[PDB]
Every structure is written in structure tokens, then in C-alpha cells.
Design a protein around this ligand. Structure first.
Ligand code: HEM
Ligand code: LG5
Length: 289
């Protein structure tokens, strides 16, 4: 199964920087969401979930087709809460009806990471909306109650190695868990992209507790929480080395996250050799906006 990137007719960098800017300005405006976290974190999670359906074995799923717009995927229990991100993006799509759905969802995540002071994440256009019958079944996104071996195996389906997994997981510095979405809860409120996920793993005094949904999670006094799968990154010796590396090198973390996140958002897509180079968007701050 081959998905060839096809640039939205006539469009160029500048068109996409205007979409980026509309997303970024809305992120600034709609500040009250989720007790003033704002929409950044949910948009990152949306971009990941629309991509994380991909299966390297047959090229099913993935960001290309924009299939989250269809009820089977929209209603996946693994996607509970992402409707908030979709509804944030609806007026953006209204304004720029020419962008594909996969382009919009993925660009939302890039815009969120950057506006949250994260690394620059190069982004390529040309995902093309595919029909309802191409929507992947539920059950392709990962469970949170499992161990390191589960995480490692899971991510092989997405063609991600240990470093890529540990880097991607650093997004769990952002936002929070909500009991009614996932059966996990914490006092998370962070909307600045940093390496503090790794610092927190190493430096906090973690307690394995049961939450109000009767699920186990790791809690600290300071208010942080880690899923079992997060904590597994310090229970496995190979993951632990990489957690230490990122806890000790913010720039390396940024660089590795950028590469892994772009890769995640591009898995399954064939870029023609005369496709445009990846775009690196300016932040609102860089533009004086
Ligand atoms: C083993 C892999 C992973 C598991 C089991 C997992 C699980 C979860 C769970 C259960 C939540 C809480 C959802 C809710 O209650 O609203 C969550 C939130 C989140 N996840 Fe993951 N996740 C994983 C990987 C990732 C990756 C790879 C990224 C992106 C690079 C990501 C980004 C996020 C973000 C940004 C949030 C916060 C959402 C918000 O604040 O609304 N996750 N994750
Ligand atoms: C703040 N967050 C904490 C986690 N353990 C997972 C997602 C987000």
C-alpha cells in the first residue's frame, strides 16, 4: 500500500505558515481550556494518535489519510478527549478549507510543540484525505498499564527504536491525565516543552498507588504522576541510560524529539524526489506577532 504525498494545488511555504499562525494565534486566545493549560498538549496528543495507528507491515493507518474525521476512529476509546483538539481545529479548517485533514492534524502538533517553546520540528505537506473504508480499526494505540517489554514491542510496529521511544515519551511532560478519558489522573498543568519528564522520573520520590478508577499509577508529593509505561523507562536498564542522557542534555533531547516526532508524523508517506523540502515554520514570537 503506497501513499504518495501530493502538495495542495498551488500551495507553498507561505500558505502553510499562515495556517501555522492561525493555529498559534488561537492557542494564545483560547487560554482557559483545561484549567488554563490551553490546547497545546491535547494538540500534540492528537497528532500522535492520528499517526500512531500506523502499521509498518502493511502501511495501514498513519497520518496520511486523515481518517480521525470518521466516527470509528473519532470514537476509539483510546482517543477519548481528543475531540477537544478536533473542535479547536475546526475553525482553522473552515478558514483554510484547502488543507487536508492529515496535514491539519499533524501541523497542529508541530505548531503546539513550537509555540510551547519546544524544538523546531520540520514538517512536510501533502497528506491526502482517503475514504471512510480506509479508517483503521480501534486497538492500535498503546495501553498504559504495561511494562518495558510491552512498550518496546509496541513501538517496533511504528518502526521506532529505544532512543526514539524514550525521546517521544518526553511529551508526557505536557498537559495531564484525566480520569474520565483514560482512567488515570494527576495534577499536571505544564504547557512549556522541556526535558522535565526525565528529570522528574529520576529525581522524584515515586509511590505506586491506586487511583479512583482502581488503576495503578506512580505518584509523587510534588503532584507529578507517571503511568506504568512511563515508569518502565527507569525499570529497564536500556531505557534508563537514555532517560539519564536526556535529563542531562536539554539540547540533545530537543534534537532527538524533533527527529522522532517528524518521523512519527511522516510514517507511511512516500515523498516524491521533487517534493518540496520540509518546512520549518517561524513561531509567532520570531515573527513579532
Ligand atoms: C506507551 C506509550 C504511551 C501511552 C501508554 C500513553 C498514554 C497516555 C495517557 C493514558 C494519557 C492521558 C489521556 C487523558 O486522560 O486525557 C496521555 C496523555 C498525553 N500523551 Fe501519551 N501515551 C504514550 C505515548 C505518547 C507519545 C509518543 C506522545 C507524543 C509524542 C504522547 C503525548 C501525550 C500528551 C501531550 C498527553 C497529554 C494530553 C492532554 O493534556 O490532554 N503520548 N498519554
Ligand atoms: C502530564 N502527563 C503525565 C503523564 N504521566 C502522561 C501524560 C501527561
Amino acid at each position: 500500500l503506497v501513499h504518495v504525498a501530493s502538495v495542495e494545488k498551488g500551495r507553498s511555504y507561505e500558505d502553510f505558515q499562515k495556517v501555522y499562525n492561525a493555529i498559534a494565534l488561537k492557542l494564545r486566545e483560547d487560554d482557559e481550556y483545561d484549567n488554563y493549560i490551553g490546547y497545546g498538549p491535547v494538540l500534540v496528543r492528537l497528532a500522535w494518535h492520528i499517526s500512531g495507528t500506523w502499521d509498518k507491515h502493511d502501511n495501514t493507518g498513519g497520518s496520511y489519510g486523515g481518517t480521525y474525521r470518521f466516527k470509528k476512529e473519532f470514537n476509539d476509546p483510546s482517543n477519548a478527549g481528543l475531540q477537544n483538539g478536533f473542535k479547536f481545529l475546526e475553525p482553522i479548517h473552515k478558514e483554510f478549507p484547502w488543507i487536508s485533514s492529515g496535514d491539519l492534524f499533524s501541523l497542529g502538533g508541530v505548531t503546539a510543540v513550537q509555540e510551547m517553546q519546544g524544538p523546531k520540528i520540520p514538517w512536510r505537506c501533502g497528506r491526502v484525505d482517503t475514504p471512510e473504508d480506509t479508517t483503521p480499526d480501534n486497538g492500535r494505540l498503546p495501553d498504559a498499564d504495561k511494562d518495558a517489554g510491552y512498550v518496546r514491542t509496541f513501538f517496533q510496529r511504528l518502526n521506532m527504536n529505544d532512543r526514539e521511544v524514550v525521546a517521544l515519551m518526553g511529551a508526557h511532560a505536557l498537559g495531564k491525565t484525566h480520569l474520565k478519558n483514560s482512567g488515570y489522573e494527576g495534577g499536571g498543568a505544564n504547557n512549556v516543552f522541556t526535558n522535565e519528564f526525565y528529570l522528574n522520573l529520576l529525581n522524584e520520590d515515586w509511590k505506586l498507588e491506586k487511583n479512583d478508577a482502581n488503576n495503578e499509577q506512580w505518584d509523587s508529593k510534588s503532584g507529578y504522576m507517571m503511568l506504568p509505561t512511563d515508569y518502565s523507562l527507569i525499570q529497564d536498564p536500556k531505557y534508563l541510560s537514555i532517560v539519564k542522557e536526556y535529563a542531562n542534555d536539554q539540547d540533545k533531547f530537543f534534537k532527538d524529539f524533533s527527529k522522532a516526532f517528524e518521523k512519527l508524523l511522516e510514517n507511511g508517506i512516500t515523498f516524491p524526489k521533487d517534493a518540496p523540502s520540509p518546512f520549518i515554520f517561524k513561531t509567532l514570537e520570531e515573527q513579532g506577532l
